[PDB]
Amino acid sequence: SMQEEDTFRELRIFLRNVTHRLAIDKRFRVFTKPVDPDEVPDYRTVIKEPMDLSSVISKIDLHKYLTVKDYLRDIDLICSNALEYNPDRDPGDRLIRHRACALRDTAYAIIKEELDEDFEQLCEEIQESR
Numbered sequence: 001s002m003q004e005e006d007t008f009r010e011l012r013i014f015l016r017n018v019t020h021r022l023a024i025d026k027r028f029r030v031f032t033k034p035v036d037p038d039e040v041p042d043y044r045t046v047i048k049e050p051m052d053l054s055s056v057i058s059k060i061d062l063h064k065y066l067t068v069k070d071y072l073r074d075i076d077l078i079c080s081n082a083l084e085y086n087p088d089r090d091p092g093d094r095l096i097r098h099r100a101c102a103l104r105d106t107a108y109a110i111i112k113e114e115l116d117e118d119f120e121q122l123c124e125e126i127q128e129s130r
């Protein structure tokens with residue numbers, strides 16, 4: 001229905017606003033663009049599904065996310081990719097791990113405060129009907 005397409009439009013507006021707020025935070029600069037194959041040729045041999053905040057905006061606009069659950073699986077993949085690629089005790093690996101945890105925790109905190117639970121449940125029931 002037109003009403004269901006208005007529901008998914010409102011979801012995309014909400015997801016673009018949360019993603020912009022994460023992308024401008026200086027802590028999360030390393031997560032804003034794909035890893036350059038030049039500088040890290042090893043990356044795409046270890047990490048089988050790369051993800052970053054520029055790719056997330058492109059996915060919103062391609063209508064890849066019908067629920068906030070869907071979106072949070074890609075925020076969780078940005079964070080788990082950084083934990084698995086940088087697992088060592090040295091300061092450069094500990095710094096990116098602490099940033100990746102802060103990106104995940106910050107996204108979940110904004111959604112807990114600003115997402116209405118009944119809006120999410122509506123998106124889930126339209127998705128399950130298709």
Ligand SMILES: CN1[C@H]2C[C@H]3CN(C=O)C[C@]31C(=O)c1c[nH]cc12
Binds near residue numbers: 069072115117
């Ligand atoms: C997005 N979803 C739904 C449910 C809830 C369960 N989750 C599993 O990962 C995260 C979660 C969340 O934080 C919400 C805040 N309002 C609605 C929601």
